[PDB]
Amino acid sequence: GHRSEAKDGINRTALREIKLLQELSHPNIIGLLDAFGHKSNISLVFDFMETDLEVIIKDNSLVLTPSHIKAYMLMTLQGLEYLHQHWILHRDLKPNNLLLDENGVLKLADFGLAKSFGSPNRAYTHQVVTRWYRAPELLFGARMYGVGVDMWAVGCILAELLLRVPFLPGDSDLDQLTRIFETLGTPTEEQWPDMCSLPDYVTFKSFPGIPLHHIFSAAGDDLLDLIQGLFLFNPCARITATQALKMKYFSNRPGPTPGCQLPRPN
Amino acid sequence: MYHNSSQKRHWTFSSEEQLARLRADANRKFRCKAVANGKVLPNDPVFLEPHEEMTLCKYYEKRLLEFCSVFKPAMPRSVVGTACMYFKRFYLNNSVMEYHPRIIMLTCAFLACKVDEFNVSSPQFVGNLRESPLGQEKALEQILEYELLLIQQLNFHLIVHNPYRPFEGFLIDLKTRYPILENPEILRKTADDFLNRIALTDAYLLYTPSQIALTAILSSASRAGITMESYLSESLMLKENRTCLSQLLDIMKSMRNLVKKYEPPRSEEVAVLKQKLERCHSAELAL
Amino acid sequence: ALYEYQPLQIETYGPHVPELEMLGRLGYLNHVRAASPQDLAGGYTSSLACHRALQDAFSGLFWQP
Amino acid sequence: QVQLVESGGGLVQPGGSLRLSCVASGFTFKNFYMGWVRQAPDKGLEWVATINSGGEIQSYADSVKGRFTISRDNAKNTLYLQMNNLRPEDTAVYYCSKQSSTPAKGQGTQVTVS
């Protein structure tokens, strides 16, 4: 781990967006329309989007029906499934980075933290993903991880869809861990066996947690089943984007709202 | 992934002749530009021939390989293959007479360290140059000046697929499904040397990284006197599609011929051409 | 219209990469470095390294420009 | 009181097969992710397999991938682990585990592969 600025030339974060989005093409992933520079400065141009998921969540006048939420989750997981099949982690999923065009098409956007994964010879930064959406293995300092770092954030986005409020708003890395454990319970070794081996692992008081059906009173069994799989503590057992799309929640009767019928913020 | 990559879509060409035409095209354009500036005549012997630009590119490519092998922070192999790929692509459409290969080969390695996420600081990078701290800073300034230019000449296609990971994939498949080859690890030594040989040819611009890696393995098996045609027909199931088995066998023969006819740059010829190239820059033909 | 899962179909121009469950029972994972408990704790498994190496090896094997 | 009762263990030869059962009681079995964990002597706990509440998705450890199959019958409140092509390294005590929320683990059944 190293770098700097001002004498390193072109911003490495912008190079991440260029090098990755130049290899990807999917309806639910933002498209790079133009890139240009001048004297180690660089500028990127993307598809013109109308709004993002955060303003939709914050719009008190906007009513989120079960069909609306299913459509947002479907498009998010479809773009994320494409990402993971090309061995790329987004590592910054949040409502800010889920943009919607004028036709109700959701696209993953900020790839400044995205990175390829799957290689055993590469070490990975654990200080990724915005704190409120960061998986516990990252808070425990994991330098080798997988798709769970995205799926945990997807669970926090779905929880913010249902609650219209940040699910786990930690003030610090330790406060984020307390909120995770006092809300979902503290994992035992049977639920996360090698958890103690993580570089920045810290032992917490055993909290029982709040039952999911109490946290999400408006969710049915199929939706509760999906949420539970996204928040499994074991990062190897936590469901993948493909597994999430194959769950009964997405194929059940309420169905997803078409893109042209999704609500448009005020 | 390669099968839908920009490398496959825009930077994999059909023939050596296409590569030669692009390089001769870059050489001719610089000549026209220099003559247009009214300093030189259309056939001034200061101009380098396309075959002389190639000899200098072979030389500075080996110097780039040598620079990476001694890089103080141990450099991953994927950074080196990415940097060499950048170097090949740049002088496909540019002349060594306009942008000096010495500065460009360092910019390729500098950019490859960022793209591949091999995070070294700028002083850590130029610290590997055996020059004074006065000169190491001058080299860094020139690298930052050519950095944007390199990305433009690559059409902002930065991801390079190397044959190193495909090489490991076949070994896993060999160790798993091909017991006929007892201990596939015996081939790694010779296949690695064969792999390094094709890296100096234009094979990176003509073949897929998977074909390159399989060629190195099967060639090493041929050296060890080991038959493994059944790995292609039976294990890779090319018994079904005979036209694809035929194409792949032709691709591997073409690659082995690329290495057979590779001409290393002679040291005396490099000395002459470096002298001519240096005179070409000092006259400042650009303007 | 209701939703039903359809797998994404992308041409690899190469041999068939074994399914994830075949990696275990056919012994593919015997020939990749075993993941340390610190790796399993973060989610990294040996099947990740094995699968990507297999995919990169077969990707574009049959593609000719 | 919560209770998980494993059964089905025994001595099996290399390459043989065994199915383990786990009868759950004291909680709403259908509403929880369930899983299997195993512990061999002089070795730490090893996650084996997990299945969701609805049962349509499963996840397996690399060491048992392609050989084991986890399933559940929510009507009978039982969890299953089909084990095929058993190897000597599969020898361990096998435990049914509540993989979500309040933790629960049974007493364990011994599987021995010679």
Author numbering:
A (entry chain A): 46 to 311
B (entry chain B): 1 to 287
C (entry chain C): 244 to 308
D (entry chain D): 1 to 114
Provide the publication's sentences verbatim:
Cyclin-dependent kinase 7 (Cdk7) is required in cell-cycle and transcriptional regulation owing to its function as both a CDK-activating kinase (CAK) and part of transcription factor TFIIH. Cdk7 directly influences progression of the cell cycle by phosphorylating and hence activating cell-cycle kinases Cdk1, Cdk2, Cdk4, and Cdk6. As part of TFIIH, Cdk7 is involved in the formation of the pre-initiation complex (PIC) and phosphorylates the carboxy-terminal domain (CTD) of RNA polymerase II (RNAPII) to facilitate promoter escape and RNA 5’-end capping, thereby regulating the expression of mRNA and snRNA11.
Here we determined, at 2.15 Å resolution, the crystal structure of the human Cdk7/Cyclin H/Mat1 complex with the kinase doubly phosphorylated at S164 and T170 in the T loop. For structure determination, we reconstituted the tripartite human Cdk7/Cyclin H/Mat1 complex comprising Cdk7 (2-346) and Cyclin H (1-323) in complex with a C-terminal fragment of Mat1 (230-309). Doubly phosphorylated, fully active CAK complexes were crystallized in the presence of ADP•Mg2+ and a chaperoning nanobody, VHHRD7-04. Two Cdk7/Cyclin H/Mat1230-309/VHHRD7-04 heterotetramers constitute the asymmetrical unit cell of the protein crystal, exhibiting a high overall similarity at an RMSD value of 0.28 Å over 624 Cα atoms. Unexpectedly, residues 1-49 of Cdk7, which form the first three β-strands in the N-lobe of the kinase, are not visible in the electron density map. The nanobody VHHRD7-04 interacts through its complementarity determining regions (CDRs) mainly with the C-lobe of Cdk7, with some minor contacts to Mat1. The canonical pT170 residue forms salt bridges with R61 of the 56NRTALREIK αC helix, R136 of the 135HRD catalytic site motif, and K160 of the 155DFGLAK substrate interaction motif. Cyclin H residues D116 and E117 that form intermolecular contacts are located at the tip of helix H3 and constitute a di-acidic motif that is highly conserved in cyclins. As a result of this intricate salt-bridge network, the αC helix is pushed toward the active site of the kinase and the DFG motif is in the “in” position, indicative of an active CDK. The second, Cdk7-specific phospho-site pS164 is buried in the tripartite complex formed with Cyclin H and Mat1.
